[PDB]
Paper text:
Inherited missense mutations in the myocilin (MYOC) gene, within its olfactomedin (OLF) domain, constitute the strongest genetic link to primary open-angle glaucoma via a toxic gain of function, and thus MYOC is an attractive precision-medicine target. Myocilin has no known function, and there is no glaucoma phenotype in Myoc knockout mice or in individuals with a homozygous N-terminal truncation mutation or hemizygous deletion of MYOC, but rare non-synonymous coding mutations lead to toxic intracellular sequestration of misfolded myocilin. However, not all mutations in MYOC cause glaucoma, and common variants are expected to be neutral polymorphisms. Among the common features associated with pathogenic myocilin misfolding, we demonstrate that a single metric, OLF thermal stability, can robustly segregate benign from early-onset disease variants.
V449I, a conservative substitution found in a hydrophobic region of the OLF β-propeller, appears only in gnomAD. Assessment of spent media from cells expressing each of the 16 full-length myocilin variants revealed WT-like secretion for T256M, R296H, L303I, S313F, V329M, S331L, T353I, A445V, V449I and K500R. Structural integrity was further confirmed by high-resolution crystal structures, which were solved for 11 OLF variants. No gross changes from WT OLF were detected for the structures of T293K, R296H, L303I, V329M, S331L, E352K, T353I, K398R, A445V, V449I or K500R, indicating that these mutations are accommodated within the native five-bladed β-propeller fold and do not perturb the dinuclear calcium-containing site.
Author numbering: 244 to 502
The structure:
Amino acid sequence: GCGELVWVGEPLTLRTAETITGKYGVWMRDPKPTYPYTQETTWRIDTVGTDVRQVFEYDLISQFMQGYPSKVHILPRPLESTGAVVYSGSLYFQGAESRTVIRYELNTETVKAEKEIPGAGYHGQFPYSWGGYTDIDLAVDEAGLWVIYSTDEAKGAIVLSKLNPENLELEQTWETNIRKQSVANAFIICGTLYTVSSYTSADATINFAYDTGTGISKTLTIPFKNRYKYSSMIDYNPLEKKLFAWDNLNMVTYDIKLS
Ligand SMILES: [Ca+2]
Ligand code: NA
């Protein structure tokens, strides 16, 4: 059931980090789960610091919300920022101090592919407005895997490319007119990129949309609340049809409605 985003619900807090290491981070579920994982499996990465390698895995939602991890993976290379996603059994993440996206197969703890995003800025060139080295933001929607970034040629405007999930090849690329550093985060629903106006305000909005099918850009005014005043990560999960976010220690989710 695809459509245009028309409404975002109130943020629901699912878990609160207990240490400064989790002030910002990324938490994820797989919209295309593969054995031995399920739709309940959750991954959490606390991303403060300079050698981020621990990925907490939870077999069950109950464990994610109330307990300890069922497994901890130690990544073979440190990770950059909050942009990572899980898709069809692999964690896709950006190597620290690089423009390299890495496909890490979770069940075998193996790197399956690595790819430089051509021309992509990295390490504070085209972050979202809060900074945090958020130059490169992976995304999953109803059609698969994407990457959101910018380049010098695009003068910092958001660029998005569809990615082959097996080998990380770029399949198609679109250039918007939205300055990436002017928005708080972004995500893709049904092939339309949406941006968030502010990472601090209780009265933020979903403020722009770019439809990859038509090339048309629009301005929106859909209310979006940053309950804890510091959202570092905002992504869409196309299986649950919800936003997943990280806001000032808190792993939160938002219902949405499409029309
Ligand atoms: Ca995002
Ligand atoms: Na992301």
